[model samples]
Target: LEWHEAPTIAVALLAALGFLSTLAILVIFWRHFQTPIVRSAGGPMCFLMLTLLLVAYMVVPVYVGPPKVSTCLCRQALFPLCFTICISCIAVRSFQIVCAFKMASRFPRAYSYWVRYQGPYVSMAFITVLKMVIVVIGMLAYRNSLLFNTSLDLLLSVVGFSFAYMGKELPTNYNEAKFITLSMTFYFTSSVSLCTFMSAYSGVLVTIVDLLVTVLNLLAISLGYFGPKCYMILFYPERNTPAYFNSMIQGYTMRRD
Candidate 1:
């Protein structure tokens, strides 16, 4: 799949940039965890997201050459693992917001518990278990059935879409669900056609597409969420205080009320 040296170099460079940018964001998050954006970024969930993205970047080099047994194994296992970890956080965050808005008046105490604990931990665990189950089922099916191994990917997109719809009406300023939805949809769309070439195309095109999609997806998360957050923490330090976050929380409550 090597037509020339330049395209290969370009793909490798994009992968490196994507990896570096995400690593920088993770470092920034660690250094400024006290900031408002970092604090509310679902502390563990944010860490997990960054960690998974970093791993995703680390695997970018694997996609450079033609597909081998090892490459296919990496693509099948690690890539979907990364996708589930990243989007699971988004789904949990979105559902947490939806839960708060739905329960603020009717179940104050319960909503409080949901906010303080379940949103980040319980929901994440649920999604993780769910993905594991899906993967297991897909593996069994692949052994016994004729279906494409992509059945699991289809399920991933479906779950993400449901979570996306959960926060559709959230206030524009605070709405992060839409971004998750779009990213998942992009993943879904990309994977939909990916299988078409899994057998038919046997060259660098497959890896090239995989690398570009990975790079673009990482860029989306960095720019959509972390970029502006880092900007405020760096330049507008005043706005990254607890008091400011508290004010925003109160404002959201008032709006919902």
Candidate 2:
């Protein structure tokens, strides 16, 4: 199969741009690592998620290239694994934020215990390892293990969405529930459409469809979640300060009573 086909070239360029944009955002996050904006966005955890998005972007090309056994295997395993890690990260972040706000006062000792022991980190590790195990087993046991992967992903998305929804009234600067909700919706649509497209077509058509869906999903996440943070970091320096975030939090607390 020719790699230089018109649609393939288009998709490759899109993937390249997507990768570059994500890389640029990651750099911005690092440069402003000490800022409240980046800190509230999960800091280093955000870095890990962006890195996985980069991996997902890189994996898109393997589908368009001439098929080989190893390439086939890599494409199947890498895409799902990257996304699973990303979803797990989002889920863990959402859960932690909700617990911090809702449970800290209600169960002070429990909240302290969770934080003292690094509960979020441990839970993230557990979820990642769990997905990895599922992927390995699925790869060995079935010709199409994507169903299992997608189902788990959907479950994680639901969990993340619920947590985000509960935190909808959080301080504006620290509030990412709306963005998380948008990304989760994009992911669900992309996954469902992928299955439908795969069933309806074969050959290069399927490859193109896959590339489109994958790139769109990545864009939905990187842009929907990180774009605003990057915008404020570069253009709105005053808002990135602790005083600003503190004011917002103060206002939120005032409104609660």
Candidate 3:
């Protein structure tokens, strides 16, 4: 039997890389958002995406695929999974926004109006259940048949609703909306491209699409983090809002009771 070959990079190297990348992001975003609401919200999402990207690039490819299963190929899972996470988070955020807006309005207690107070709870519950179901279904489908991705369509279709719904609600404002929208937009493009590439005969275009995504994201974030503060002017309105509050180190705004 052939021994399983390890990935090009060692786990220690991957961990070190992940750590450094995380530290770099934290340092950059430390002063990025004036409000803790946006800062804290952004932190966990980017961190998880970075962590998964690191690990997927490091190890997953080493153990999966046919014709000797090149480790590089298995890393493809990261983008889609990351997209899923992004979609779910954005969905929840949109739900949060919808809830806030409705709660402040003079609308009746209709089913649609329940979005304000009830969104977070429902989103949390649904995301959790959806993840569990996907895991279980993937494992079962993988074991039972070779056509797992085909069988996986139904599960993806269901989860796609959350993403589609959330994506539709994402265009509220620039600061928060821009990053979230860009992330999901690239994610969707990469996903559809990759899926199509996979279905084509004798094609490796899917893999190339991910590489393009990585390249584009790298450039986008590089310029974004290092670029001049062009959006500073837009903060005046937020600063004047009642929810805006200032602390000793930094200022922030949150919803009022």
Candidate 4:
């Protein structure tokens, strides 16, 4: 499917709109990053996740309507790379939340020391570098040459980690479960939607399905994770205040105790 052979204005427009939306989200998150509300919401990892999502939106669409080897390679590399960065942060944050409560409950001073010494950042950086290495090996071994099956197998690693990340905390009663709920739901829905769109139709309808899934995937993460935080920041500044955040933290600490 060459770009010129079947360039749909609607898909192009939608991709452009998605790009613009990512920009807007960057600005919004950047504004809030300096405030404690953002930290309490998800901390610096939130900023990294959203930024990586923005990068995904920017690069994924290049191969949307066409099958040029250049754009195809770009999409293959950038899509996985960006998503790995984003999802790795998600994994780190989820585990960090679990340890922050459960492990801290047992070894409060050690957990505090780890956090005070920037443990989360180190773990995130390590995971990110490891993923990048995997991507490089994947590209050398499977890029351009591999067809759908190979690609699917390569992507399964990501799928595995994503599922693992979402289920990191075992205790359903933990406060992290609530946050994990949002992540699992969004990814599950988006995955089902993508597959359904891919197999449900053909021809022009297929193009439309592709477009629909592309935008819908972005919307899923945007709305699921950031939507509530954005609402609190914009409409309920009272809730976004530091006092409220510390109170929430205190409640979690009390529960762990």
In lDDT terms, which candidate is top?
2
Clashing residue pairs in candidate 2 (N, C-alpha, C atoms within 3 angstroms): none
| Candidate 1 structure quality by residue, lDDT tens digits, 114-172 | 76775568867886777676665666531222133345544655665675575666654
Q: What is the lDDT of residue 134 in candidate 2?
A: 84
The candidates, ranked best first by lDDT, are 2, 1, 4, 3
**Which regions of candidate 4 deviate over 4 angstroms?**
2-14, 107-118, 141-179, 185-215, 251-257
Model 3 Cα lDDT, one tens digit per residue, 1-257:
11243432343344345445545554544545455443434445544544544453454334333435344333324433443444555455544554443443544465364555575556556765665466546544311321343233324434444434434433223124445445445545644555555556455433334344443443343234223222332344453222442341122133242
Clashing pairs in 4: none
Q: If scored against the real structure, what TM-score would every candidate get?
A: 0.77, 0.92, 0.48, 0.67
**Which 10 residues in a row give candidate 1 its minimum summed lDDT?**
141-150
lDDT of 4 by residue, 1-257 (tens): 43543445555666677667667766887876667656655666676677777676766456565457887567546655554555556556655656655656777888877788798788668766666665566567621432342343335334444544544434322234454455455555655555555545554545445445545555555555566667667787776666776677677546764
RMSD of each: 4.0, 2.0, 8.8, 5.7
Candidate models: Cα lDDT each: 0.66, 0.79, 0.42, 0.58
Overlapping backbone residue pairs in candidate 3 total 3
> What lDDT does candidate 1 reach at residue 49?
84
What candidate 1 gets wrong by more than 4 Å, as runs, is 1-4, 107-119, 133-173, 196-204, 255-257
For every model in order, what is the number of clashing pairs? 0, 0, 3, 0
